Design a protein around this ligand. Structure first.
Ligand code: DT5
Lengths: 296, 258
């Protein structure tokens, strides 16, 4: 623990605080997460049990690497490979010019590759958003902050409901479905794909019913035709306004035919029709995919 | 059949070999025995019933305990403390609403303090190097269940029952991988209820024949036959209720013809 020189704070996620640090001895630059344990109360938080145990086996280029767990009795510390920026800051730094399409393509391809690896190792991330996606200077993007992650089962079970950040949260959650699985993570990436293309968040509500309405106003109010079962879901209400589906060429104008195809599959209301991460990798949108380096 | 089911199955088959305890660990434990471990596991079944915990949590706690005892000598008076911390860690991993530490203190009838339980929790974590996402019999069983024609709930419940009995007896079940025990348990429940056998689709999926499942089958049949005379009875009482369709009341077949 004495080998680490904290440089600054770089984030504060689901739990604890994260610093940029340097190994005094090797010069390696790392991200240091601090979780306080203040003995008297409840022990090590479940948020950390999950994140550490899951990350120990989520070793992939598009997931942030956990290098070490330094476990004092007063604190718990996680050492991660350092990434210099999140997708949010990158999206703000190119509000005007927009991110170039090759870079969108490649980031999406990479995010799908990292998410497929999770799903295929029975982990749900459950908090995908622009500030949890980390980039380096070489063109990579990685999934980060697994504080809200869990190991799911085949078949799934009721899991925690208070899940995913409001703007990125799938409708089966908003409407209160008994069950959700890997599809909730795909919805979030759909939202993120769209945000990368237009500069602005896709569905930026400020309450649950506002979030619903915002989704409805764009994708059309869901009904039995589009999503068998909606009208019988626990928090579905008959008095929901009936907005017509907006056309994708107005939701997401810069996208070509392939991209709209892909985006509509990530954003299907029905979780059983929502494309998988692995299946998405096979989509024609990705045939000409490269690895562009940002002007960073 | 969900999106990643074959991939997950393959990965679980990879992890179950990395998550095994030492086969004969108990033989170098100077104070505790397989018999005390049976008492501990049986108590933990009782605890899981009382707090409405998932069976998956039970299975994880036992894995933690066996991995822990594989590398730490433990005195009899501290055995319960290892288990309670194991249960607490399993609950935090698996449950939506884990019981509080004060509730785990309370069910040891105040044998240990809250301090002791939290320190053990920390020590278990260190010894296990935070590797808590172990494959369990339960996980393989629910996957096997998807290859049933069609779903028989009495088979499912009886297989869970047999897979749980295996938690109690470290000799012999520590010899078998979870995927193997689940197979043995799936076949034994199938045979018992409907007369059918380990289906071809599972042979394809697992690579397991009735021949590879034989040794474990032979043990599990004995375990099943002797279950009503065993010193530990919490599981038999558990699976007597209607929620499990009273499957522990059913008669084990006399021969398996294998
Ligand atoms: N604000 S920023 O300049 O865009 C930025 C964002 C992120 C970082 N690096 C970072 C931040 C971070 O924060 C945690 C908690 C907050 C959400 C993201 C993960 N965890 C990390 N693991 C490896 N790098 N890393 C550095 C700078």
């Amino acid at each position: 623990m004495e080998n680490f020189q904290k440089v600054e704070k770089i984030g504060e996620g689901t739990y604890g605080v994260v610093y940029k640090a340097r190994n005094k001895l090797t010069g390696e630059v790392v991200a240091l997460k601090k979780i306080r344990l203040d003995t008297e109360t409840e022990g090590v938080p479940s948020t950390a049990i999950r994140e550490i145990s899951l990350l120990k086996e989520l070793n992939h280029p598009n997931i942030v690497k956990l290098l070490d767990v330094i476990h004092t009795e007063n604190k718990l510390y996680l050492v991660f490979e350092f990434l210099h920026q999140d997708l949010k800051k990158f999206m703000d730094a190119s509000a005007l010019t927009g991110i170039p399409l090759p870079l969108i393509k490649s980031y999406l391809f990479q995010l799908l590759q990292g998410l497929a690896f999770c799903h295929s190792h029975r982990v749900l991330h459950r908090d995908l958003k622009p500030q949890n996606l980390l980039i380096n200077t070489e063109g990579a993007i990685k999934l980060a902050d697994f504080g809200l992650a869990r190991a799911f089962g085949v078949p799934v079970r009721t899991y925690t409901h208070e899940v995913v950040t409001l703007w990125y949260r799938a409708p089966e959650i908003l409407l209160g479905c008994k069950y959700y699985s890997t599809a909730v993570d795909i919805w979030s990436l759909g939202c993120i794909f769209a945000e990368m293309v237009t500069r602005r968040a896709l569905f930026p509500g400020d309450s649950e019913i506002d979030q619903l309405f915002r989704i409805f106003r764009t994708l059309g109010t869901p009904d039995e035709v589009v999503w068998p079962g909606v009208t019988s879901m626990p928090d579905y209400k008959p008095s929901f306004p009936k907005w017509a589906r907006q056309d994708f060429s107005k939701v997401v104008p810069p996208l070509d035919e392939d991209g709209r195809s892909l985006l509509s599959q990530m954003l299907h209301y029905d979780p059983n029709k929502r494309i998988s991460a692995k299946a998405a990798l096979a989509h024609p949108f990705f045939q000409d995919v490269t690895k562009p380096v940002p002007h960073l | 059949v969900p999106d990643y089911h074959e991939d997950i199955h393959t990965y679980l088959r990879e992890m179950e070999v990395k998550c095994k305890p030492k086969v004969g660990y108990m033989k170098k434990q100077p104070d505790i025995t397989n018999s005390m471990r049976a008492i501990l596991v049986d108590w933990l079944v009782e605890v899981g019933e009382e707090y409405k915990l998932q069976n998956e949590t039970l299975h994880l706690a036992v894995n933690y305990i066996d991995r822990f005892l594989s590398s730490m000598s433990v005195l009899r008076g501290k055995l319960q403390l290892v288990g309670t911390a194991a249960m607490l860690l399993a609950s935090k991993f698996e449950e939506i609403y884990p019981p509080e530490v004060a509730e785990f203190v309370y069910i040891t009838d105040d044998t240990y303090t809250k301090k002791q339980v939290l320190r053990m929790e920390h020590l278990v974590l260190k010894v296990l190097t935070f590797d808590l996402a172990a494959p369990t019999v339960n996980q393989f069983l629910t996957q096997y269940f998807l290859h049933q024609q069609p779903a028989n709930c009495k088979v499912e419940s009886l297989a869970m029952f047999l897979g749980e009995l295996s938690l109690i007896d470290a000799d012999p079940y520590l010899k078998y991988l979870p995927s193997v025990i689940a197979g043995a348990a799936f076949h034994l429940a199938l045979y018992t209820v409907t007369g059918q056998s380990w289906p071809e689709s599972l042979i394809r999926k697992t690579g397991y024949t009735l021949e590879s499942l034989k040794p474990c089958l032979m043990d599990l049949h004995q375990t099943y036959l002797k279950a009503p005379q065993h010193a530990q009875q919490s599981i038999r009482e558990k699976y007597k209720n209607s929620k499990y369709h009273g499957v522990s009341l059913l008669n084990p077949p006399e021969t398996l013809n294998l």
